[PDB]
């Protein structure tokens, strides 16, 4: 038959379901970034948990090792590229010091509110879902879309959106046409 298509899980749940010293921390963190549910918080911890695992393995090798130099710098370059890692912290020891708020900072939902295009963070998510925001010349409706540094400057309203020079929406057309 046809070749199988690969797929994988993108999150992992806590070992202890009920622990206030984490439930409150998660909710405080979800409220700050306007997240829908706890799984969007589990997802950040999962990808940060395997980056740490990758970083530990390269750090055990000797310096100037070919694998440590190639993959460590490449992973760092991508992290600087998405704006998570600062240009003065490319040492793979500050990589271990990263925290989940660094990744939620680079989401499209976080950047739209923080760019002044929205009144609040919950306004940012609904603007994205309702096809109002375009990055470059492409409409993006994914709130978790991670903004790159070179794409940061090109965040604005969609060219055919009511708020960005487009036509009037469905509701307004119903009132002014009567």
């Amino acid at each position: 038959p046809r070749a199988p298509r690969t797929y994988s899980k993108t999150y992992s749940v806590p070992k202890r379901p009920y622990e206030s010293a984490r439930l409150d921390a998660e909710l405080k963190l979800a409220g700050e970034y306007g997240l829908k549910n706890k799984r969007e918080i589990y997802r950040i911890g999962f990808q940060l948990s395997k980056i740490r695992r990758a970083a530990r393995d390269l750090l055990t090798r000797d310096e100037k090792d070919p694998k440590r130099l190639f993959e460590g710098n490449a992973l760092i370059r991508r992290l600087v590229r998405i704006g998570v890692l600062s240009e003065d912290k490319m040492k793979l020891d500050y990589v271990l010091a990263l925290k989940p708020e660094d990744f939620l900072e680079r989401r499209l939902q976080t950047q739209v509110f923080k760019l002044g295009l929205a009144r609040s963070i919950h306004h940012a998510r609904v603007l994205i879902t309702q096809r109002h925001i375009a990055v470059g010349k492409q409409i993006v409706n994914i709130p978790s879309f991670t903004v790159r540094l070179d794409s940061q400057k090109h965040i604005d309203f969609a060219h055919n959106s009511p708020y960005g020079g487009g036509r009037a929406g469905r509701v307004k057309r119903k009132n002014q046409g009567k």
């Binding site: 409150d24 909710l27 979800a30 409220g31 306007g34 997240l35 829908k36 549910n37 919950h122 998510r125």
Partner: protein, 60 residues
């Protein structure tokens, strides 16, 4: 075990529980809105009694 007994009393308490209807209360928000509701309720306007915090305070 020595096992038997009258089967006549099945459902005794549930049958005689007086049926009480649920008041037709407003719907709760779903998704992102409900997490927003809980966050303020636990970190913005905290209702603590001098360190004394209750999620479901009985009317006492």
């Amino acid at each position: 075990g020595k096992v038997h007994g009258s089967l006549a009393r099945a459902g005794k308490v549930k049958s005689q529980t007086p049926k009480v209807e649920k008041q037709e209360k407003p719907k709760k928000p779903q998704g992102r809105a409900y997490m927003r509701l809980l966050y303020t309720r636990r970190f913005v306007n905290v209702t603590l009694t001098n360190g004394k915090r209750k999620m479901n305070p009985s009317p006492a």
